[PDB]
Enzyme design. Sequence first.
Site, short mmCIF file in Angstrom:
data_model
loop_
_atom_site.label_atom_id
_atom_site.label_comp_id
_atom_site.label_asym_id
_atom_site.label_seq_id
_atom_site.Cartn_x
_atom_site.Cartn_y
_atom_site.Cartn_z
N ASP A 199 -4.32 11.31 -4.07
CA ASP A 199 -4.28 10.69 -2.73
C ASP A 199 -5.41 10.83 -2.04
O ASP A 199 -5.70 11.92 -1.53
CB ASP A 199 -2.93 10.89 -1.99
CG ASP A 199 -2.80 10.19 -0.81
OD1 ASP A 199 -3.43 10.45 -0.29
OD2 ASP A 199 -2.17 9.24 -1.00
N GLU A 227 -3.87 5.90 -4.14
CA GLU A 227 -3.41 7.01 -4.91
C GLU A 227 -3.12 6.74 -6.48
O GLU A 227 -2.68 5.58 -6.68
CB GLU A 227 -2.19 7.78 -4.41
CG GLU A 227 -0.91 6.93 -4.51
CD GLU A 227 0.02 7.48 -3.47
OE1 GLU A 227 1.09 8.23 -3.78
OE2 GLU A 227 -0.03 6.86 -2.30
N1 LIG Z 1 2.37 0.76 6.47
C1 LIG Z 1 1.35 0.38 6.18
N2 LIG Z 1 0.70 -0.59 6.35
C2 LIG Z 1 -0.53 -1.12 6.45
N3 LIG Z 1 -1.46 -0.18 5.52
C3 LIG Z 1 -1.08 0.90 5.44
C4 LIG Z 1 0.46 1.28 5.50
N4 LIG Z 1 0.43 2.53 5.03
C5 LIG Z 1 -0.77 3.01 4.56
N5 LIG Z 1 -1.67 1.90 4.79
C6 LIG Z 1 -2.92 1.86 4.21
C7 LIG Z 1 -3.78 2.60 5.16
C8 LIG Z 1 -3.84 4.06 4.49
O1 LIG Z 1 -5.32 4.43 4.92
C9 LIG Z 1 -4.02 3.79 3.06
C10 LIG Z 1 -3.33 4.82 2.39
O2 LIG Z 1 -1.94 5.20 3.01
P1 LIG Z 1 -1.70 6.73 3.20
O3 LIG Z 1 -1.86 7.50 1.79
O4 LIG Z 1 -0.26 6.60 3.55
O5 LIG Z 1 -2.40 7.42 4.28
P2 LIG Z 1 -3.76 7.69 4.60
O6 LIG Z 1 -4.57 8.03 3.29
O7 LIG Z 1 -4.40 6.99 5.53
O8 LIG Z 1 -3.52 9.22 5.08
P3 LIG Z 1 -3.12 10.71 4.29
O9 LIG Z 1 -3.06 10.23 2.84
O10 LIG Z 1 -4.49 11.55 4.44
O11 LIG Z 1 -1.90 11.11 4.99
O12 LIG Z 1 -3.08 2.48 3.06
CA LIG Z 2 -3.81 8.74 1.42
MG LIG Z 3 -1.25 7.33 -0.18
#
Ligand SMILES: Nc1ncnc2c1ncn2[C@H]1C[C@H](O)[C@@H](COP(=O)(O)OP(=O)(O)OP(=O)(O)O)O1
Ligand SMILES: [Ca+2]
Ligand SMILES: [Mg+2]
EC number: 2.7.7.7
Length: 430
Positions: free
Chosen positions: A16, A119
């Site tokens: 991820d 991911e």
């Molecule tokens: N609810 C949402 N609405 C719109 N975009 C989203 C949402 N959730 C996630 N995204 C997008 C932005 C994120 O950078 C990307 C990957 O999500 P996510 O893996 O949950 O978090 P992240 O990669 O930003 O931080 P991390 O995984 O380190 O906690 O998808």
């Molecule tokens: Ca992520």
């Molecule tokens: Mg993710």
Amino acid sequence: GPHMATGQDRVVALVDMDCFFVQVEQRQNPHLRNKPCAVVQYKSWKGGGIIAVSYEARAFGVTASMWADDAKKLCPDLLLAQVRESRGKANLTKYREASVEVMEIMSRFAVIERASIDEAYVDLTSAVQERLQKLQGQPISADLLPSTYIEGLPQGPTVQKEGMRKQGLFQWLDSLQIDNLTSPDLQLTVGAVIVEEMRAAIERETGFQCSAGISHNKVLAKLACGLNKPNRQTLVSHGSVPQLFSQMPIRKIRSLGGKLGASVIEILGIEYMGELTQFTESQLQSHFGEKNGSWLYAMCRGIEHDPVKPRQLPKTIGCSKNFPGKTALATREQVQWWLLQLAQELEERLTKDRNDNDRVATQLVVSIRVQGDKRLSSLRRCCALTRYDAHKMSHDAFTVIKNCNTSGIQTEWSPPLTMLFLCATKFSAS
DNA sequence: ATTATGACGCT
DNA sequence: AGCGTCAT
Ligand SMILES: Nc1ncnc2c1ncn2[C@H]1C[C@H](O)[C@@H](COP(=O)(O)OP(=O)(O)OP(=O)(O)O)O1
Ligand SMILES: [Ca+2]
Ligand SMILES: [Mg+2]
């Protein structure tokens, strides 16, 4: 005893990306690197909505789902990058293209399942068997696992996080029995070596960091991945599951974060995943249905069989826009203009998809929401998608929804539309 | 006015 | 098929 399957047949990883849209913007704009920063879409309403947050900014309490104006109250120096707008709407193309970069690198090591924009799951069982033979019963050096955590270790008989990590890793490796080529623990360890290599490749070739989990199935790999974010990977062994699950809220396990998980808690009067072990399979099936019951019975023991699907590309290509509050579409020509905007983005993405991926979508799904309802979708209708043409697609969409219009006058639209959605589905090779 | 997606389950 | 659930 000897006939009791332990779900240790596979090696599965989940990779991820860390703070993914933020890293995409930080690569592009060096000024944003190593700063509290976030990615925002739109701006006029409360500063825009935050959808990604750097770890520096999270330290101030900034989260996704937060309005930028509120985030700025927690973190006045927060830097912001805006999602591109095209044809009147947020356009996520830059992030989809960055996703393809990472997915293609991962695919070099093994067949992957694209689980989200940032991911993917990896089935490393075969790759691990391969590497095990080249190793030839040679021990795995700690040096091959420079960013790996072993969940549950160290134990027994210290100040540093990095020092703790190595302590745990050394205990793990010291206990490893590398003479056995079918030891699940050894297989996981080699899996972790491969994921170090995968993650190094991703960072080398894209500039993006990520975390990962390595375990025997998708749910444990996903859970593992989050235990040590960012920029680290975590091995969750079969043996680590009883302790891990003994204090693990049920909602943390993928698929249990919603109504089903709440029902598990309410009906059974429990809080933690480990507490599920005291119920029979038939008991769990009686409350949650045959499939869920069997799934829960195995899952709380660390066992899950969901395969990593060989699918690298999304199965659908969709375009959606909300029209909140007062911006809700109340005229026919409003509705038609926005259907066209969505259709034009959809055509653009579809045409590129056909060229890249040798397939054609055959079904168009049209969804709207009407002011009043608080379901995501109020109405979903499909029609044929025979040509990649935005004017045809938007005209077709209008046809399948136009009778949702309650107003006796056909210039007006009632109730006003608070959402439009166009989705291309049912691909065929071409 | 927590937006823009995307997969899979139910009947 | 259209809807709901869960997820990022
Ligand atoms: N609810 C949402 N609405 C719109 N975009 C989203 C949402 N959730 C996630 N995204 C997008 C932005 C994120 O950078 C990307 C990957 O999500 P996510 O893996 O949950 O978090 P992240 O990669 O930003 O931080 P991390 O995984 O380190 O906690 O998808
Ligand atoms: Ca992520
Ligand atoms: Mg993710």
